[PDB]
Ligand binder design. Structure first.
Ligand code: DCP
Ligand code: CA
Ligand code: CA
Length: 430
DNA sequence: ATGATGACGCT
DNA sequence: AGCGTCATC
């Protein structure tokens, strides 16, 4: 009882941008605002494949992966922006540069872990403590939290949704332990007020809206962020967890969306995250290994110790192109040419990274695929990255793959290549 | 025939 | 080192 760790030691937030790429396109072209639209890659094949969808467009059933032409059946008025194309390949710099905008603002509040192009985790333990001293044990006005939901409230003994939001908010705030500094619920609340600030800062300074989750760890924060999208934040407290997890499908938890999660269901015969609490740490370890068993044991009780890593920049930089079906590469003459195009973009990206961030990459990973094989990568080989020269990298990248070419006939390339991937890594200070 | 990323774990 | 998983970058 008194020596049980309840995982209330930190305050963590996850901020993720709403329909990010679409927002970037809509800030640029006002015609796309307040309209079902989507962001698209390579117009030729079926209007291009959709990679981002506005919320107005989601109301018609339009989804990522979907071809635009199919998407226009569900929603004839759908507007598209296209990804910039630069060497017969998609160039994402617009959305990288837009992400930096966001990460720099967030970096002003707390040290962030960049988790993707449009999302970072934040550790607010310090900012909350330091802010608790500044408020003179005064209450927290509801006006400090104009977009916050409290998961599981209102409960106990106004139909429209802002009505409920306020009701849970007041119920929560009315019940608060302002006298106690180390009350975890009070901490989450201060954290939440800071995130209102962060988010109001992001929008003022970029015009981009986001949602956020606030909890005691990265996995709850992540989960919480999804609960009230778009343009809202959610607080998931320790106490809400049993009810939240009691009907939460296991696959909704980060790192259980794939096969490990599939086997937790199949082995244990359960559907929901709360059903894991009926199993011992030893039982869980026997089934899924020591590291998973322990992590699962804790997680279903809302406890997770994975830290918010101080890393605003990427640790690898890379470019891939897929050559599906008919298009697969079957002449060394065109393997060169694509390795050159890739290497060119990479060099563009690398030299920028060297001046911006004061670091140089030192290793060049070269991956490829071959026709028939249905695994992201067939093989993967490293070599030194001594110089930011596209012709040298692409040559080196070629050198590192011929072996694989089964062709006795010299001009050709067998079997054909379904994908080329080049990636800079082993960074070092510069 | 979504395609283009990136982090991390296991051996 | 090189392969595999996870997520969504
Ligand atoms: N498989 C994917 C997933 C995402 N993205 C890009 C486009 C998205 O705009 C952005 C962020 O993706 P999210 O999965 O966070 O989803 P969105 O931000 O598009 O919308 P939301 O997060 O509001 O659901 O990353 C992509 O190119 N390919
Ligand atoms: Ca997003
Ligand atoms: Ca995201």
């Amino acid at each position: 009882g008194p020596h049980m760790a309840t995982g209330q030691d930190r305050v963590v937030a996850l901020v993720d941008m709403d329909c990010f790429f679409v927002q970037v396109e809509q800030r640029q072209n006002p015609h796309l605002r307040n309209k079902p639209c989507a962001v698209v890659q390579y117009k030729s094949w079926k209007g291009g494949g959709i990679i981002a969808v506005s919320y107005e467009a989601r109301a018609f059933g339009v989804t990522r992966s979907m071809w635009a032409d199919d998407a226009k059946k569900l929603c004839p008025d759908l507007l598209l922006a296209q990804v910039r194309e630069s060497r017969g390949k998609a160039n994402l710099t617009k959305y990288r540069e837009a992400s930096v905008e966001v990460m720099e603002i967030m970096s002003r509040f707390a040290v962030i872990e960049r988790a993707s192009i449009d999302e970072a985790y934040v550790d607010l333990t310090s900012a909350v403590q330091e802010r608790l001293q500044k408020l003179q044990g005064q209450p927290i006005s509801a006006d400090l939290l104009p977009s916050t939901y409290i998961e599981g409230l209102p409960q106990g003994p106004t139909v429209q949704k802002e009505g409920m939001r306020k009701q849970g908010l007041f119920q929560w705030l009315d019940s608060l332990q302002i006298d106690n500094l180390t009350s975890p619920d009070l901490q989450l609340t201060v954290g939440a007020v800071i995130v209102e600030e962060m988010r109001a800062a992001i929008e003022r300074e970029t015009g981009f809206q986001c949602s956020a989750g606030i909890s005691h760890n990265k996995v709850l924060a992540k989960l919480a962020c999804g609960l009230n999208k778009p343009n809202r934040q959610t607080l998931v407290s320790h106490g809400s967890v049993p009810q939240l997890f009691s009907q939460m499908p296991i696959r909704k938890i980060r790192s259980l969306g794939g096969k490990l999660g599939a086997s937790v269901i199949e082995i244990l015969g359960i559907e929901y995250m709360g059903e894991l609490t009926q199993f011992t740490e030893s039982q869980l370890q026997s089934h899924f290994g020591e590291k998973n068993g322990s992590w699962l044991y804790a997680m279903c009780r809302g406890i997770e110790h994975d830290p918010v890593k101080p890393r605003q920049l990427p640790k690898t930089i890379g470019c891939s192109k897929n050559f599906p079906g008919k298009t697969a590469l079957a002449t060394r003459e065109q393997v060169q040419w694509w390795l050159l195009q890739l290497a060119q973009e990479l060099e563009e990206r690398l030299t920028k990274d060297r001046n911006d961030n004061d670091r140089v990459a030192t290793q060049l990973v070269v991956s490829i695929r071959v026709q028939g094989d249905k695994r992201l990568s067939s093989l993967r080989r490293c070599c030194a990255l001594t110089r930011y020269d596209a012709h040298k990298m692409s040559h080196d990248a070629f050198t590192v793959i011929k072996n694989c070419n089964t062709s006795g006939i010299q001009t050709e390339w067998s079997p054909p290549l379904t994908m080329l991937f080049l990636c800079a890594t082993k960074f070092s200070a510069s």
